[PDB]
Amino acid sequence: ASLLDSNFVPINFTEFVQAISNTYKQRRIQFYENLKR
Amino acid sequence: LMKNPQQDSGLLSNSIDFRDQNLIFSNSGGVCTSSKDKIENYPAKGYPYKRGVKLSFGDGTTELEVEAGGGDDLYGVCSDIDEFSGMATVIPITNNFTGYLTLKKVNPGDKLNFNQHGELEKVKSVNAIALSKAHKLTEDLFIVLASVFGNRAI
């Protein structure tokens, strides 16, 4: 469950916060994939 | 000598660091604020922004106002102002405040008081303690971070 997935519909603020954390983690992984030292 | 003077320019200013960026005259309110703080507003006479204020009475044709003053007539601290309506936002002296106030033209821990113009000055009857040194904004404009936490016995 991440904010990147548009089909994700949070029910409560706890799920929303969890989705925010997952979004940050996925963005970090994507940044390391895109980065080319 | 206004809170947020407005002027267009041909160039954008550059921000380099996130530190020492709150030391501007436009920064209103308190540096650390509680949701239970009591806030009032009054018609402003003069320009009492970031100064201690007193209740001033006219001929009775108009309502009472607040003007920059201190001493034994201190009523509160003017933390914000709206220039369109001439409204001064006042924190009563019964509520503690922590923020930048105008200082008379001083080191952390020094005891301060309010002069006749509402400016802070080094020492009486009010708990006012400086938390930093004076910061010069204009030739006659100095601001200091301070904590005001009530009155004093004698």
Add this chain to the structure above:
Amino acid sequence: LMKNPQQDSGLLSNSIDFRDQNLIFSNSGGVCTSSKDKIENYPAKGYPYKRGVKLSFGDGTTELEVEAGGGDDLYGVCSDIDEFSGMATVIPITNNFTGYLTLKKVNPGDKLNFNQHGELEKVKSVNAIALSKAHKLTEDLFIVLASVFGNRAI
């Protein structure tokens, strides 16, 4: 005041070198230990760790204890402490010992004696000889390698 470091370490120890890795307060026992050494335990009164101890008696309701001390009351040296049960491991003065002991706030070959607080000091009643120079652990705590072999004459 504790056998193991009270403060949890902020880093991971580097396990590379093998030299000068034993000058720590957590080094219990002796540098040279014999399998025929007589070892006792006693209820601990205070923190006599790495200190000379004496027998302390009370009203008689409870059994005797051991506390840091020396002089004519020296009974043994405390080489280990179990904190959970308050048990002090004592090596009797009739058994020779070689290890790191607390030094009063000294060069190899110096003759030492135990003071009223169980600390070794440069010299009478007890045969103790320092085998190294004082190593500073805390600003008030020093340890010295020493050999204690019985009680001398006169």
Add this chain to the structure above:
Amino acid sequence: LFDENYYAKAVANIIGEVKDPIMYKWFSPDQIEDVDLQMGYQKTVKWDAFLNANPTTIANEVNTISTIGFSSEVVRLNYLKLQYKFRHLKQTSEKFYTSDSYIGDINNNLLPFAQAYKLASSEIIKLINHFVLTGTVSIQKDGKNQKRLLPNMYGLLNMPEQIKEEVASGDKDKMDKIFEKIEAGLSKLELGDEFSTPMMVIVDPATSLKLVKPYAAASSCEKWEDVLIQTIKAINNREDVYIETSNLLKHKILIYPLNSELIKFKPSKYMLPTPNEQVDKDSTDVAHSYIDFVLGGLLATRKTILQVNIKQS
């Protein structure tokens, strides 16, 4: 939730416009692992052995033998929960401040919730980057009036038990002297059997300027930067060496390996800014919101970070 909570909906819509932290470039992907702990501590145990005296010669009869001692160390990582508050316009009050060009009050510095949240999150991320690099929290350029943190909360620049070198004030413009100190620190580094790893060097702009002058008659082809890369490749088993420049640093050089065994960052999964459910509402157009973040989680081995400080006295 998005039907009832406009602020949550706005945060979801605007969260993608906040840029990634720059501290991600200072680590490798394997060196970052999240922990589910908002506030508290994490404990690890390590065991070590040491020799107490010279070994004992076995000849004839003897029963007094030299001993080998053991010790245990408990490493603890503390995490702290911090919060900011910011003022903004109430949702229903925007239409009375929607100018043609923008939305918001210019005179009183009031912004809509989305823009205010984005700007505040960016500033908080800058603060987090500064903490992770230097290990201090302050809003003054002087660096004074620091926030009192818990123990066992360190950054790359103040981690204790690491190699520190100092370049004298009179030699602050001599690249040869600076690089001599760098050589001394590189020699004193102790990477053990984890030496075959890439290395990272973080420098300040002045040092970056000095690194491009020719090596010294000065060498025609090679530069001081090339000499530094070769020197580091000497100790890292000729692995990759990455050089980064940061404006946060001032006259300081930081060299450390990009290996998870020696240095590892275990941030809380809630380290980056997260909105709070509580919103202060009133009878006016001004509302207040809160942002939470978590600080702490850097773990390093002793004598694996080289910190060179060029005194500008």
Add this chain to the structure above:
Amino acid sequence: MKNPQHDASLLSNSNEFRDKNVEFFASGGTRTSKFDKLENHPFLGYPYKRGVKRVIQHYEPHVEAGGGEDLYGICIDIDEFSKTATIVPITNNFEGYLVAKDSTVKVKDKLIFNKDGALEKVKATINATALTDAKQISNEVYLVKVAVFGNK
């Protein structure tokens, strides 16, 4: 420290409801308003249930037990892990159990915070009124119920 009941030798009996609240773990106030201002500050020492003062030294200012003309507020709760103290500013009134100096404090007595942050019988500097007699909990720990309502 703050919770001396975590070293209990036996289970407590919870049938009675009278004389059950005069304890050192009763953090906060007896009567609390939703609009009471609470400020958290770093502390050095043990300021729990005592008057506190601000100490400025480089680190941010911290609070420690104190009183007299240096009185800033009252500490009502502590987080030990973060070493942080919750303080009610002296501009806000308070009713609750606070540390007293000795056991000679009686009802209706006017009280003053001393240099250690303890309440002692008496001009004065603040308005503080004892609502109960001093009650002993430890051999050197006395708590008294007090209404603190500003400065004289």
